[model samples]
Target: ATFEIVNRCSYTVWAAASKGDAALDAGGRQLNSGESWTINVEPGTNGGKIWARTDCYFDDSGSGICKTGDCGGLLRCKRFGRPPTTLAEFSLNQYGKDYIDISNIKGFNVPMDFSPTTRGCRGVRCAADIVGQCPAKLKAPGGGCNDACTVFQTSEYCCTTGKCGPTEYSRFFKRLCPDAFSYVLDKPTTVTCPGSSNYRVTFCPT
Candidate 1:
């Protein structure tokens, strides 16, 4: 099954994440709009962390979603205990310089052709040199595409045509986000409900 991720932002932004470790070392995948990633389960392995990340590269600045902001790269991570159920995620800002803990919400099953024009997110056009002449999906008419090799696209040139897409880009994005702010499942401080199927709790930000 797949889950849809709605971009609460006003405009479209470049998103990415890496599965497992090693896969997201600065070079990972770039995800598409409304894409869903299938969750993988390793029974005896116990708790496994899904280290994920997203960045903005709008048409305004040089890098980041717009490149010029102090928010060069908004990095965030959420921990998952055991296996996840549906599509689950944590708010980055909510973490506030900390990593959020994700319950067993299963994995993000993102599929291709995710965010189309009328979807949770909207696509934006890019300048020829912003990364390429066109947007992430489109390329400059006369020249090669962005030099950056996203997990989704093989190259700026490949993206010019249908050959390169968001699959590789999404893979790359997931890989590079959380090395410093690592994710780990922490035992609930207090277990109020014993022998319960599930319990809910909230920790206020100090």
Candidate 2:
């Protein structure tokens, strides 16, 4: 299995991912505009996400901070990225298919295009302009928009201790990126592909 992380945006984006607490096969690297990096992974890998960080400032030692999607303030991410980021989630080789989706349930920081390079695999994308239209109440401190759960932290918004459904807050994001998960328990967000299919994840795809 492999991931071709492509940066199509006009600016730099730091690509990041992890596989069950272990860094991705070629995880944690800076992606210049129009550049790309490929990561090869073992078959049947499960439970992880890919995301991008922007406006990062790091020293030669790789210690730094990101304006969005900071992961323990480290260049080499040992953990999942912070919220207010767009994510490509996956569980490969599950039930004879690969489960994947673009999630804004954590809120979106950048546009994304995730899909298989193989024939017949459905593509899932969330390329809406989220930052420009972020609700004032859910605005992240640094940049991007925060998810309703992160902003409100209430039962209704967070779906704590009960069956979950969308609210006005979640609806806002759904309207923009209908294919992405806007809240916990959001339905119809998953896109399945054949197991071990090759994939390409592009940031800021035009």
Local distance difference test scores for all models: 0.24, 0.88
Query: Over the stretch 1-206, how does candidate 1's per-residue lDDT look in tens digits?
Result: 11233332232322322233321222222334433233322222212233222333434333333121112333321222111011122222122221123321122211111212122222111111222222354232222221223213334323454354333332322233111111112132111111111111111101
- Model 1 accuracy (lDDT, Cα): 0.24
TM-score of 1: 0.22
Residue 122, model 2: lDDT of 90
Which residue pairs come into collision in candidate 2?
A: none
Tell me the TM-score of each prediction against the true structure: 0.22, 0.96
Model 2, 19-138: lDDT tens digits are: 648878755899999998998867788887899999999899888999888888888787888888899999989878888899998888989999998975798998888888888998
- Candidate 2's displacement at residue 166, Å, is 0.7
